[PDB]
Amino acid sequence: SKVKQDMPPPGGYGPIDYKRNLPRRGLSGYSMFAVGIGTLLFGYW
Amino acid sequence: TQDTQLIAVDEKLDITTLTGVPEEHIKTRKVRIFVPARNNMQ
Amino acid sequence: GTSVKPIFSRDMNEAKRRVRELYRAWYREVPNTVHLFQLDISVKQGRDKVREMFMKNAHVTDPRVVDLLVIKGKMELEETINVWKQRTHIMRFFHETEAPRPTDFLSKFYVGHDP
Amino acid sequence: LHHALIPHGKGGRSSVSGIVATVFGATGFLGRYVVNHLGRMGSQVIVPYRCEPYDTMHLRPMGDLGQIIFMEWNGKDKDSIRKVVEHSNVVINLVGREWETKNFDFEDVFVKIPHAIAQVSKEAGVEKLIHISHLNADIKSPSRYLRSKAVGEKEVRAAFPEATIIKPSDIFGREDRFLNYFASMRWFGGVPLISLGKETVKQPVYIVDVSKGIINAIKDPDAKGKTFAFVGPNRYLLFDLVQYIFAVAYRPFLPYPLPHFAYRWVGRLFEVSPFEPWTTRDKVERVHMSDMTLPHLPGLEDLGIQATPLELKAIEVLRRHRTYRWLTSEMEDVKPAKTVNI
Amino acid sequence: GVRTSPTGEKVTHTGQAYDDGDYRRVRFSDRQKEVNENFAIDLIAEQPVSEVGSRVISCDGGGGALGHPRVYINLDKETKTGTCGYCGLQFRQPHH
Amino acid sequence: RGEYVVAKLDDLVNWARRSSLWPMTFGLACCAVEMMHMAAPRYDMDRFGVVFRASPRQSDVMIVAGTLTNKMAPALRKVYDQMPEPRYVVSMGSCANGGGYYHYSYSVVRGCDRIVPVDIYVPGCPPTAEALLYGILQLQRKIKREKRLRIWYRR
Amino acid sequence: DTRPTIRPRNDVVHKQLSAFGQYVAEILPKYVQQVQVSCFNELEIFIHPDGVIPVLTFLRDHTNAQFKSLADLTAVDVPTRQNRFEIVYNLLSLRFNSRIRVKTYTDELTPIESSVTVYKAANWYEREIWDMFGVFFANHPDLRRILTDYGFEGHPFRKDFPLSGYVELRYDDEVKRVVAEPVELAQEFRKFDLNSPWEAFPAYRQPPE
Amino acid sequence: LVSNLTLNFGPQHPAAHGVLRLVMELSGEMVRKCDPHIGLLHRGTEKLIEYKTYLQALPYFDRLDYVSMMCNEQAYSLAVEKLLNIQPPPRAQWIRVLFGEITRLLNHIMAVTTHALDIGAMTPFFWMFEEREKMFEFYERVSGARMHAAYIRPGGVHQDLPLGLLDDIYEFSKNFSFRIDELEEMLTNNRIWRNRTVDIGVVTAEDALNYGFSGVMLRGSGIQWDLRKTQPYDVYDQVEFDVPIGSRGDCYDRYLCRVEEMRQSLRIISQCLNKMPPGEIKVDDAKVSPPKRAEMKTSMESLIHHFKLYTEGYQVPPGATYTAIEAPKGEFGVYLVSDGSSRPYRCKIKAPGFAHLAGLDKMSKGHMLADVVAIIGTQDIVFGEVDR
Amino acid sequence: ASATRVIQLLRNWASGRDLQAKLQLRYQEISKRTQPPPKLPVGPSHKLSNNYYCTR
Amino acid sequence: PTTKPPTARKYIWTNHKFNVSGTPQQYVPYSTTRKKIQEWVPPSTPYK
Amino acid sequence: TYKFVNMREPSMDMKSVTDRAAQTLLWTELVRGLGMTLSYLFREPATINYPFEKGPLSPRFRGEHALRRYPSGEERCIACKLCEAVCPAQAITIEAEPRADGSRRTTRYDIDMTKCIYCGFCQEACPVDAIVEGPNFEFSTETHEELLYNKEKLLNNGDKWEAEIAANIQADYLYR
Numbered sequence A: 001s002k003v004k005q006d007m008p009p010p011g012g013y014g015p016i017d018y019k020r021n022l023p024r025r026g027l028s029g030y031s032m033f034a035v036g037i038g039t040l041l042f043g044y045w
Numbered sequence B: 001t002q003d004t005q006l007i008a009v010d011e012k013l014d015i016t017t018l019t020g021v022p023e024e025h026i027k028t029r030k031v032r033i034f035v036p037a038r039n040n041m042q
Numbered sequence C: 001g002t003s004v005k006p007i008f009s010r011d012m013n014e015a016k017r018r019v020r021e022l023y024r025a026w027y028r029e030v031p032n033t034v035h036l037f038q039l040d041i042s043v044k045q046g047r048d049k050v051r052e053m054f055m056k057n058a059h060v061t062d063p064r065v066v067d068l069l070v071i072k073g074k075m076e077l078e079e080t081i082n083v084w085k086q087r088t089h090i091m092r093f094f095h096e097t098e099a100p101r102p103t104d105f106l107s108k109f110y111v112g113h114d115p
Numbered sequence D: 001l002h003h004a005l006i007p008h009g010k011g012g013r014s015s016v017s018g019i020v021a022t023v024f025g026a027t028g029f030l031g032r033y034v035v036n037h038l039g040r041m042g043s044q045v046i047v048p049y050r051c052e053p054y055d056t057m058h059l060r061p062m063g064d065l066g067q068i069i070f071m072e073w074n075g076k077d078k079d080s081i082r083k084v085v086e087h088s089n090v091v092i093n094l095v096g097r098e099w100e101t102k103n104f105d106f107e108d109v110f111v112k113i114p115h116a117i118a119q120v121s122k123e124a125g126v127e128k129l130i131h132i133s134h135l136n137a138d139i140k141s142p143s144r145y146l147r148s149k150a151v152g153e154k155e156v157r158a159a160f161p162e163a164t165i166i167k168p169s170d171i172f173g174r175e176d177r178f179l180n181y182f183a184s185m186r187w188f189g190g191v192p193l194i195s196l197g198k199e200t201v202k203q204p205v206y207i208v209d210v211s212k213g214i215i216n217a218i219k220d221p222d223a224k225g226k227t228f229a230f231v232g233p234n235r236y237l238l239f240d241l242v243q244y245i246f247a248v249a250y251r252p253f254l255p256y257p258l259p260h261f262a263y264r265w266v267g268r269l270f271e272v273s274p275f276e277p278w279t280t281r282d283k284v285e286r287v288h289m290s291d292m293t294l295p296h297l298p299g300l301e302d303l304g305i306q307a308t309p310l311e312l313k314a315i316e317v318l319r320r321h322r323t324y325r326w327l328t329s330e331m332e333d334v335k336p337a338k339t340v341n342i
Numbered sequence E: 001g002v003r004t005s006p007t008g009e010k011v012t013h014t015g016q017a018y019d020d021g022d023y024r025r026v027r028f029s030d031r032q033k034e035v036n037e038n039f040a041i042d043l044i045a046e047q048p049v050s051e052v053g054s055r056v057i058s059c060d061g062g063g064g065a066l067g068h069p070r071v072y073i074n075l076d077k078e079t080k081t082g083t084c085g086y087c088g089l090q091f092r093q094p095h096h
Numbered sequence F: 001r002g003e004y005v006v007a008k009l010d011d012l013v014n015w016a017r018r019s020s021l022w023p024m025t026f027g028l029a030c031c032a033v034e035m036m037h038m039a040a041p042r043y044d045m046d047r048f049g050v051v052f053r054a055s056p057r058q059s060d061v062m063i064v065a066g067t068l069t070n071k072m073a074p075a076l077r078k079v080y081d082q083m084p085e086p087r088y089v090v091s092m093g094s095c096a097n098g099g100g101y102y103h104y105s106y107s108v109v110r111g112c113d114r115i116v117p118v119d120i121y122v123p124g125c126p127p128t129a130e131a132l133l134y135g136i137l138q139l140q141r142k143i144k145r146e147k148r149l150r151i152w153y154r155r
Numbered sequence G: 001d002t003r004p005t006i007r008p009r010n011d012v013v014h015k016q017l018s019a020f021g022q023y024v025a026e027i028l029p030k031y032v033q034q035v036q037v038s039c040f041n042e043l044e045i046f047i048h049p050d051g052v053i054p055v056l057t058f059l060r061d062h063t064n065a066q067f068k069s070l071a072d073l074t075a076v077d078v079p080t081r082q083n084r085f086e087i088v089y090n091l092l093s094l095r096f097n098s099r100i101r102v103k104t105y106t107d108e109l110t111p112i113e114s115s116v117t118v119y120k121a122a123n124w125y126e127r128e129i130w131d132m133f134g135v136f137f138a139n140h141p142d143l144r145r146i147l148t149d150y151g152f153e154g155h156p157f158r159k160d161f162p163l164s165g166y167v168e169l170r171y172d173d174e175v176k177r178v179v180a181e182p183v184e185l186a187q188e189f190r191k192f193d194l195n196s197p198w199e200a201f202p203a204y205r206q207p208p209e
Numbered sequence H: 001l002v003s004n005l006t007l008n009f010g011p012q013h014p015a016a017h018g019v020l021r022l023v024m025e026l027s028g029e030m031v032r033k034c035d036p037h038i039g040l041l042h043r044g045t046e047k048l049i050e051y052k053t054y055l056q057a058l059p060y061f062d063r064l065d066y067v068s069m070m071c072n073e074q075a076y077s078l079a080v081e082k083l084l085n086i087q088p089p090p091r092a093q094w095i096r097v098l099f100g101e102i103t104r105l106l107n108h109i110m111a112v113t114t115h116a117l118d119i120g121a122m123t124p125f126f127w128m129f130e131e132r133e134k135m136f137e138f139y140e141r142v143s144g145a146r147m148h149a150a151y152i153r154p155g156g157v158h159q160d161l162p163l164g165l166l167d168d169i170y171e172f173s174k175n176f177s178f179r180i181d182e183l184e185e186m187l188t189n190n191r192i193w194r195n196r197t198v199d200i201g202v203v204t205a206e207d208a209l210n211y212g213f214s215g216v217m218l219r220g221s222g223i224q225w226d227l228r229k230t231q232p233y234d235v236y237d238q239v240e241f242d243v244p245i246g247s248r249g250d251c252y253d254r255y256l257c258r259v260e261e262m263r264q265s266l267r268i269i270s271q272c273l274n275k276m277p278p279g280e281i282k283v284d285d286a287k288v289s290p291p292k293r294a295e296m297k298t299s300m301e302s303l304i305h306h307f308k309l310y311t312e313g314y315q316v317p318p319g320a321t322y323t324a325i326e327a328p329k330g331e332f333g334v335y336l337v338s339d340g341s342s343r344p345y346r347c348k349i350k351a352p353g354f355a356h357l358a359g360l361d362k363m364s365k366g367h368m369l370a371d372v373v374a375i376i377g378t379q380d381i382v383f384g385e386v387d388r
Numbered sequence I: 001a002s003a004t005r006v007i008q009l010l011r012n013w014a015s016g017r018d019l020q021a022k023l024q025l026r027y028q029e030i031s032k033r034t035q036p037p038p039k040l041p042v043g044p045s046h047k048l049s050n051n052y053y054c055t056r
Numbered sequence J: 001p002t003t004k005p006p007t008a009r010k011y012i013w014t015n016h017k018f019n020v021s022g023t024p025q026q027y028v029p030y031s032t033t034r035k036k037i038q039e040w041v042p043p044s045t046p047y048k
Numbered sequence K: 001t002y003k004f005v006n007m008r009e010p011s012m013d014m015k016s017v018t019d020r021a022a023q024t025l026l027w028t029e030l031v032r033g034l035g036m037t038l039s040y041l042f043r044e045p046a047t048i049n050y051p052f053e054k055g056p057l058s059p060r061f062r063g064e065h066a067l068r069r070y071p072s073g074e075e076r077c078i079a080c081k082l083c084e085a086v087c088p089a090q091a092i093t094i095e096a097e098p099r100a101d102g103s104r105r106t107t108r109y110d111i112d113m114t115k116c117i118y119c120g121f122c123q124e125a126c127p128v129d130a131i132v133e134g135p136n137f138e139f140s141t142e143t144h145e146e147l148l149y150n151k152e153k154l155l156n157n158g159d160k161w162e163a164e165i166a167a168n169i170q171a172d173y174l175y176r
């Protein structure tokens, strides 16, 4: 019988992510200010 | 032999007051100073 | 070498001077300790305890031993003043819970084997 | 001595004192101190309890592992007494109650329960019994409490003739119901006292003195069949004593002469409370009574104890009753009260 | 087998039981004395003696690496049995 | 009789007291982290009503999780005294139980039960968060069987 | 390397540390009593107690030493010596990626100079040495107990201090506080005599008396 | 009328990181000086070790930094092996590095999440303590204990990894960066977290060096120093990773350093998983490491050596060493003296938290009371190793 | 893994990432709690000759 | 245990018991060793 | 190799400055934090229903101690005292003598479970697999005294837990 201990798989393990991943999401500041201004305008009207 | 302000002191060193040992375990104890005997088993 | 270096005092009179200063400080501190820690003892009792603690070391003749005793006494005084000690620490000088141990030969013989 | 009962050690918590004590009434004021003094020296303490086991928890750190044993018991059941008494060489009777209940009157706790304990202890073969009666115990007393105390002394000596009867005066301590009782009168305005308290003289004793005296009576071979009076060092007129209590607590002291009959009516009104009455007719009678003098009895000084004065231990009792204004005041700011002597 | 003391206390397999005057029996009151009722001496006494046909036999306690250190037992004495000093199993040569 | 009402009232009060066991975080040593692991999502001590509490004035149980040293014992007794009643003490780990690895040290008190009365002794070094949770539920079952009002009714 | 069990010896670092030890001994003959390199390439400088501040300052500030970090400062108790206390300075040089050990000695009554002016890290280490060994440090900004209980008597790390000390603590219900009592053990520590009567390491054999 | 509030208390406080008495006087709102009073968890560990055999002293190190158990026992094992002149096997070294990085993940999770919880962000504590529970499961599967493994020993490790453990470690690690992302999604850019950490507890690099600081407390001030790279131990020289370096030396930079250290720990763990070699897991020298139980029950020499190693222990050649590792809390070291017997003559334990907490007064200068809570949290302090 | 499509979408959007591929709760991906017996290798000095302890 | 039952032993408890702490079935420790020193018993016969 | 953690300078143009002004005035990263917590609210909790569900352990788990027997019912302990010698906490107290049948057996075997550190060194030292740490971890007691184990207590633990103790040992002995 051959030896049998805890070993990596023959092809190794798949890659593991470690780098930071904070996705970019949202609109630009121009869009936010335009929306905020238009909301107030319609409210006023 | 060195600039340490050599102060004359008696040659009866007594550190009992600084050891923190309770007074019962200084005067009443009796220590034995010896080279241990060889264990006759070995 | 033949001689040794001092801690602070180069002589026995200097050691006595510092001992007297420490005794003064402790004697003045005792009433504030009694008030602040809310001790159930009297100021006379506390000052007599301070004196009896000082009298334990009256047999010391080495100025360096006297200096180290003064250093440790000032340390204890600073623990008492700054209220680093609790009431239990101040009250440990008075062994109120420990029973009166025997002193004569006969009672020690009666209670056990210890000399 | 049985081989397991030989004293060993140095009198500390892990030592063996040779004492196996069942302390009836160990969950009370006096009981917690004798239990502590027994566990200090490494005694085997058997604690009979009828209360909720939560109420015995303060006694658990009083002795080394295995040295404090808790066992349920029923005062009206001799089998429970026998069970908690079988293996002890000394029995201490401390059970009492300053008021009658719907199930236990003064005769039950001061006559029947002590007689049962004494008789069961004699039958089981315990060498020593310490019974705690009152100094003022009297068969013709105005108090049911003291009349029953006298009857119980008779019954205990009849059942256990080698018993040591100890008769303390009004014991004071941190949870005493004597200094706290008088200090608790500030809640009803002034301090009512029959005849202004100028005819009552008290000789209170300190709790630690009583407990050390009980321990010494255990250890003293010449205490069998003896009766002790555990009185304090000084006698005080009740007015002077209460004045000193209020001065130490720093509360304003304004007494007034409530007569005897009105005070008995007050006590009767308080008995309606079904939880630890603040006062009773019996307590009103026993407060107004003077302590007797029994010079023929051995006392705390015949057991090797110097009685502690009130003016030394009153601050450790009354500092709880001081307001924030006077909470941090020395014990000597109040001069000692006037003492009446013999 | 687990017996009883004259006081009624149960006697352990080490032969322990407080005497009638020992105050320490108060620890078992309103409780129980913990005694293992499987006396190993009586259990190993119940095992048969193996009739192995050799002067020297080996015993490791059974289960190979899960037993005890393997020891060798001499079986030349015809009055005694050779027993293992680890697990107590006894061995003897066939019918002398 | 009137002992049925007292029994029901005792049952109600003891259900309310064990359903809101608010403990005090006395984390002295390694046993503190297994106790916040019993706090963690996997065991979620809050699901039993056992909240994360604060100053002893709103705490019902003291958990002594770690070695008690001589320097530290007066503070432990102080905060134990400051707990309103009813209050309970759980000794968690060998150090708090009987000294543990440091039993023979000059600076370690051999068991917190020399300082405070202890209700539950949780063994282990450290006890697993599940072991501490078992001790907590065992304390709850201790509270369930109290008979304070039935003791009072027979006084 | 047909010796997979023996720790490999690195002779280049041994030579480098030997040369630097010679360098340090030559620059400060006034204080250096002995310098040696272990078989695992660790360099020690044995100095007179007077040279603590000069040697430490030189090792910190010299451009060829740059030992900017005080890794550890401890004491060792050897009762068979008249100067029983051995003060050990462990220093690290980030610039040269090297470590050095500086050792001196003292007894119960001679003060060692405080090195807080050389390393700010020494403030608590010297307090700890004073606490556990009783060694006084002159000119220490704040010397007092750091590890032991307030009012603790003795210095526990001395070899003649008992393992469980002299006092226990427990809560006493009569006096309503934690009290201190002489130590009693329900089970005393069981002393084991483990040393073999046969010599293990011939290379460390001391010459016979 | 100088009545600077001398609030000299706070051990029972939940933010006291366990047991800490702080003696504090404030000039009104701001801190003037901090006086840490320690020793509330001093158990005489270093004296007790003198009464213990070398194997018997190993579990003491699990309980020094009881957030980084396996790193402490690795440091002690390295010291004892250096004194013994023996070498642990390659597989044991790879296992030690893998579990040291797992331990660094555990410690950094505890440090960052308890820092945030003290500041008032309680939520990230639970999310990451679930991952801590999973790593506790890894610890227990390798050793039988969740925290105090006593697994890394002088000579190697106690026993080999069970089958399927590497697969589970891989499954955990492949998802862990997503949890670091969620932790950063709550703290890193938050204008309240930065307001509590930016420019708080700033320490100068030279002043960090002179105060004996190590680890993140050094690299927060821009010092490019890491023991795993400058003075590598085990198989750390064969593993690739990055050392995150700060620029402002404040609490925020140290927090970023710890988070990026978690990421680099994942990066190291991946290589440890992929490069685990075959072979034994303790030195094949039965006078240091005990033989396999099967040989102990069959072979005379193995039985003798098992007996002697478990009663007397191995003798260590006389000598003293100072060996230090890059612990998750900084440089953890031991000054181990051997007199030639089977018990250590002296064992001084160097804990980074001791020097770091010695610098609390310096770093709290001119800061509010709420900033001292952050400064204590950024020095991550376990008093088991501060007091020993 | 039992969450509905709509709830998965809501939480993916709220977190800003697809959290269904990196669930923090373990499932059948873990290794079996019963494993085959191991067969561990021997060290370099498990030799019958050329193995004197004075050389190692 | 349905698919892989435990190995039968005659000394294994056939009835599992839960934690009996706080019950009269609780374990109480005692010394399992016998008395070390035997005292001298005096004769029952008087000398006089 | 190293990397910088906070060495990025913000861009200073119209669009970036307006982005940061909108982030300042409209609290956008605070909204990201709210979104993260909202996303966690809709995730299945990691809580298990204790005691009906239990935390996962391994055969190596070190819990309550037990003394084991051979299949014959004979004790395994032959009182070598190796476990007592190696015990880091000195939690093991042993007395032995020849048994009436001549066997080398203990008469005292105590484990102070409040001294114990549960390190498992005793079961490593044992040459006959007599002393083990079992799987049990729910044995909290209401008093300190029930944690000072006896030889009878430990043997009853062995008889109580042997069925699963033996299975755990069979699962892990090939690693030992």
Ligand SMILES: NC(=O)C1=CN([C@@H]2O[C@H](COP(=O)(O)OP(=O)(O)OC[C@H]3O[C@@H](n4cnc5c(N)ncnc54)[C@H](OP(=O)(O)O)[C@@H]3O)[C@@H](O)[C@H]2O)C=CC1
Pocket: D024, D025, D026, D027, D028, D029, D030, D031, D049, D050, D051, D075, D093, D094, D095, D096, D097, D098, D104, D109, D132, D133, D134, D135, D167, D168, D169, D170, D171, D172, D176, D178
């Ligand atoms: N205190 C004093 O000033 C004086 C006291 N004495 C005597 O000293 C002894 C102790 O007094 P002290 O400790 O202050 O009293 P407490 O009332 O504080 O304690 C009385 C004790 O008796 C128990 N007890 C009372 N009634 C019963 C009952 N029916 N059945 C069972 N147990 C009962 C109580 O148990 P539980 O708490 O569960 O009810 C408690 O343990 C008593 O004999 C008393 O009369 C004598 C002179 C003066």
Ligand code: SF4
Pocket: F029, F030, F031, F032, F065, F066, F067, F092, F093, F094, F095, F096, F100, F101, F124, F125, F126, F127, H063, H066
């Ligand atoms: S019992 Fe163990 S884990 Fe708990 S505090 Fe003590 S040493 Fe640490």
Ligand code: SF4
Pocket: K083, K086, K087, K088, K089, K090, K091, K092, K111, K115, K116, K117, K118, K119, K120, K121, K122, K123, K133
């Ligand atoms: S587990 Fe460790 S501490 Fe506990 S008895 Fe065994 S060897 Fe001693």
Ligand code: SF4
Pocket: K076, K077, K078, K079, K080, K081, K082, K083, K084, K094, K122, K125, K126, K127, K128, K129, K130, K131
């Ligand atoms: S349990 Fe094992 S190691 Fe301990 S004495 Fe018995 S045989 Fe020896």
Ligand SMILES: [Zn+2]
Pocket: E059, E060, E061, E068, E084, E085, E086, E087, E088, E089
């Ligand atoms: Zn056999």
